[PDB]
């Protein structure tokens, strides 16, 4: 394990994630994670959370002083969630980066709608 | 009517594969849900992007309902959690603070 302990603490510092005000506003993920506590379909909900942090941390690369911290935590999320499986991390990283508003992608996505729909069925 | 609606969208809208190729590589049908959760939410955001085209709004709704039925097993609860998670805004400071605060609980659920 290691460095994620100290880095999670650094982020709480920087954002003041420990003040009483944060507490009262309602839980974000934790509550949801408890309702799916006993599942196989839990991966669905966890995939959304993991990508949130991914996108959140990217939204904060401008805050240079914490950037090193975010990278260390992000690495742990990966190695844990995708069991350090290379490729599986590339596909995942490649899907969460696909932009909704790109016209070429919009047309492409729509074209592949049957191929995706049959994968679900 | 999902298939005809898929066909209706192709009518309305008339290089390198996007999802299809990725869906073939994830052979471990177990952690495949990870990748499929991303795709499903993508279409959710897309259909909502295209919510202005009234002529296809019916079509998108029908397919959207199928996705829910076939992915979340028609579970109205599981759908809300999912529909809210994808709506959570990254740029909201309150949320940024909250998310960061819960980083251990989430990290603990992943281990």
Shortest distance, CA A72 to any CA of chain B (angstroms): 13
Contacts of B98 (CB under 8 A, 6+ apart): A17, A22, A25, A27, A28
Of A109, A93, A29, the C-alpha closest to B44 is A109
Quote the tokens at residue B14. 């008339």
User: Which domain, by its residues, includes B109?
Assistant: 1-111
Q: Are A56 and B94 in contact (CB < 8 Å)?
A: no
Q: Are A91 and B10 in contact (CB < 8 Å)?
A: no
- B97 vs A contacts (CB less than 8 Å): 15-17, 19, 22
Q: How many domains is chain B partitioned into structurally?
A: 1
Q: Which of B34, B77, B99 has the CB atom closest to A47's CB atom?
A: B34
Q: Are B37 and A29 in contact (CB < 8 Å)?
A: no
Quote the tokens at residue A58. 């990217």
Contacts of B52 (CB under 8 A, 6+ apart): none
Long-range contacts at A54-60 (CB < 8 A, ≥ 24 apart) = A54/A93, A54/A96, A55/A96, A55/B90, A56/B90, A56/B96, A56/B99, A59/B90, A59/B91, A60/B96
* Rg of chain B in Å (alpha carbons): 17
CB pairs under 8 A between A and B: 190
Report the alpha-carbon distance of residue A107 to residue A82 in Å, rounded: 30
CATH number for the domain that contains residue A54: 1.20.1250.10
B77 touches chain A (CB under 8 A): yes
| Residue A111 host element (H or E) | helix A103-111
Report the alpha-carbon distance of residue B30 to residue B26 in Å, rounded: 9
- A78 vs B contacts (CB less than 8 Å): none
Q: Tell me the technique behind this structure.
A: X-ray
- A43 vs B contacts (CB less than 8 Å): 31, 33-34, 37
Q: At what resolution in Å was this solved? A: 2.9
Report the alpha-carbon distance of residue A69 to residue A38 in Å, rounded: 31
């Amino acid at each position: 394990q290691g460095q994620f302990f100290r880095e999670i603490e650094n982020l709480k510092e920087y954002f003041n994630a420990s003040s009483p005000d944060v507490a009262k506003g309602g839980p974000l993920f934790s509550e949801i994670l408890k309702n799916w506590k006993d599942e196989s379909d839990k991966k669905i909900i966890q995939s959304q959370i993991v990508s949130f942090y991914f996108k959140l941390f990217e939204n904060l690369k401008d805050n240079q002083v914490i950037q090193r911290s975010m990278d260390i935590i992000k690495q742990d999320m990966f190695q844990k969630f995708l069991n350090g499986s290379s490729e599986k991390l590339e596909d995942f990283k490649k899907l969460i980066q696909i932009p909704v508003d790109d016209l070429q992608i919009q047309r492409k996505a729509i074209n592949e709608l049957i191929k995706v729909m049959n994968d679900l069925s």
